[PDB]
């Protein structure tokens, strides 16, 4: 890890061309040091969709628990782009605080979205996943039912 | 000229395979001449014909309802038009956007096959998001890092080919213009960019 890029980028992340922010998000990501999990949170909150996925990308490959709270507010952010990779990203760093948000995005409005989220649940697992299962298969409906009593036959 | 717009059913996710039909005469024809490209990231993505209806009047109501278009011969004003989000540092999107279909699938497919190490699926992946590139500014690392896209280094290297041909830059392309219809959403359908190039 070179403690220069790391700054380098972070500095970025506040330049004023949200293509530089994007580069610098996803570099973040693939260096890996947890320096950046902060900015990459702020950087969740920026006004360009592109740089929202790239920082919740970003966060999901350095796994950093810190970012929970933060994307699962993303899940609801009005991108799907962005909620895809937010859910993508809370799969990834897999702790079970994301199940039940995780679990009411089966019911997004974009279908790729929603079976984002069905996989971040697989990729969790576990009893909080499977009771949240359960509780579907019995009272649930559309497609938040169909994953659930597919995920009850498979596990 | 009015036509149906589609997916073919076959892709998972994002992108999916999109084909044409005249509406006069709908057959669930795959032929290369077929072939389009969402032209609008952001916008929906044209319900499936499912392949287990092989004619148009055996699909049960009601997903016969597919989005209608016009198509209209594309020009860079028009290509602006229905692409607002379009590359703004691109003078000529419409030589840029002929550059990357001229290059990639299907026009090119032996090329982007021999030489770039692609099956025919994953050329035309590239291609689509190579237009996007242009149609909807997506930058190199939401398509290659960050998008969910998955690309293996053959798929980085070819998009990188297609993106620089684009940017680098007679014939033109067809545009579809999202008219109405579409069972799964009804409104706010992508409009569609040909792939056939077009002597004028």
Redesign the interface.
């Known amino acids: 890890t070179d403690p220069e890029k790391v700054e380098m980028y972070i500095k970025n992340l506040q330049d004023d061309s949200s293509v530089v922010r994007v580069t610098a998000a996803t570099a973040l990501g693939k260096i890996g040091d947890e320096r950046a999990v902060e900015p990459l949170i702020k950087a969740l909150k920026d006004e360009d969709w592109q740089v929202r996925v790239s920082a919740a990308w970003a966060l999901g490959k350095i796994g950093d628990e810190r970012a929970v709270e933060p994307l699962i507010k993303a899940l609801k952010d009005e991108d799907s782009d962005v909620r895809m990779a937010a859910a993508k990203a809370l799969g990834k760093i897999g702790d079970e605080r994301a199940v039940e948000p995780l679990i009411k995005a089966l019911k997004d409005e974009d279908s790729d979205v929603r079976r984002t989220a069905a996989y971040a649940l697989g990729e969790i697992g576990g009893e909080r996943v499977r009771a949240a299962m359960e509780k579907l298969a019995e009272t649930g409906t559309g497609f938040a039912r169909k994953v659930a009593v597919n995920y009850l036959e498979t596990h | 000229a009015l036509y149906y717009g589609w997916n073919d059913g076959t892709r998972?996710?994002?992108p999916y395979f999109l084909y044409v039909s005249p509406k006069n005469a709908p057959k669930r024809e795959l032929k290369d001449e077929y072939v389009v490209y969402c032209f609008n990231k952001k916008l929906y993505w044209p319900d499936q014909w499912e392949s287990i209806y092989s004619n148009f009047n055996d699909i049960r109501s009601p997903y016969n309802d597919l989005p209608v278009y016009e198509k209209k011969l594309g020009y860079d004003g028009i290509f602006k038009q229905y692409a607002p989000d379009y590359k703004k540092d691109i003078s000529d999107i419409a030589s840029a956007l002929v550059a990357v279909l001229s290059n990639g699938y299907p026009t090119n497919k032996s090329q982007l096959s021999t030489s770039y190490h692609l099956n025919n699926d994953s050329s035309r992946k590239v291609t689509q998001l190579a237009i996007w590139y242009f149609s909807d500014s997506?930058?190199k690392?939401?398509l290659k890092?960050?998008?969910?896209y998955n690309l293996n280094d053959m798929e980085k290297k070819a998009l990188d080919f297609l993106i620089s041909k684009g940017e680098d830059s007679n014939y033109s392309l067809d545009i579809y213009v999202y008219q109405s219809g579409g069972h799964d959403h009804m409104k706010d359908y992508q409009n569609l960019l040909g792939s056939t190039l077009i002597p004028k």
């Open positions: 998972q996710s994002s997506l930058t690392e939401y890092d960050t998008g969910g």
